Amino acid sequence: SGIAEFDGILDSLEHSKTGISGSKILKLTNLSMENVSENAQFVASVYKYAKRAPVTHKLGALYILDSIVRSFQDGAKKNNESFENPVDASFSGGWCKAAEITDSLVADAIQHAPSAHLPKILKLCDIWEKASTFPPEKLESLRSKLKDAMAL
């Protein structure tokens, strides 16, 4: 459908108690896959939501990022598109842009999220490793930062 609907769902999630919604994650993912030429708008809207969201909501924003990045990656494989040489207006472009904001969103969640949410981000690294979503060097950096943040 569109970016206006996507931003409207993010607005509703911002006002929710937990920021975690399986139904909203699926709706947001469909809107981004139905509008791939506008992937810069959808990726930028997730970045803006994650950064402004309450501290309790950073994990839910990472679940949105997770679903969207893996869906662009699936689309790219289907269309024989490379992550190393992405088509900006197509699935590989979206996969590349979502990768570009991942470090910032994980770092922001490390700084603000309740400590209980931090092992849940380690679980995303495992999902990404299994799906080969991000290069191992990126995943090692994220894992190291999360392990450091979990204190002891």
Residue numbers in the entry: 2 to 153
Sentences from the paper on this structure:
Seb1 has two ordered domains, a CID at the N-terminus and an RRM-containing RNA-binding region closer to the C-terminus. In contrast to this widely accepted paradigm, we demonstrate that the fission yeast CID-RRM protein Seb1 drives transcription termination of both types of Pol II transcribed genes. Using a multidisciplinary approach, our study demonstrates that conserved CID-RRM proteins play a key role in 3′ end formation of Pol II transcripts. We present high-resolution structures of the CID and RRM domain of Seb1.
Thus, we crystallized the Seb1-CID1–152 and compared the structure with other CID structures in complex with CTD peptides to determine whether interacting aa are topologically conserved. The highest affinity was observed to S2P, followed by S5P, S7P and unphosphorylated peptide. Also, several aa make phosphate-independent contacts with the CTD. Most notably, a Tyr (Y64 in Seb1) forms an aromatic (π–π) interaction with Y1 of the CTD in all published CTD-CID structures (Y62 in Fig. 2e and Y67 in Fig. 2f) and a conserved Asp was shown to be important for Nrd1 function. When these two residues are mutated to Ala, binding to S2P-CTD can still be observed (lanes 7 and 9) suggesting that both aa may contribute to the S2P interaction. Y64 and D67 were predicted to be involved in phosphorylation-independent interactions and to therefore affect binding to all types of CTD. Indeed, Y64K reduces binding to all phosphorylated and unphosphorylated peptides; however, it has a stronger effect on S2P than S5P interaction (lane 4 and Fig. 2g–i). Despite Seb1 having its highest affinity to S2P-CTD, this demonstrates that disrupting interactions with S2P-CTD alone is not sufficient to observe the full phenotype, and that interactions with S5P-CTD are also required for proper functioning of Seb1.
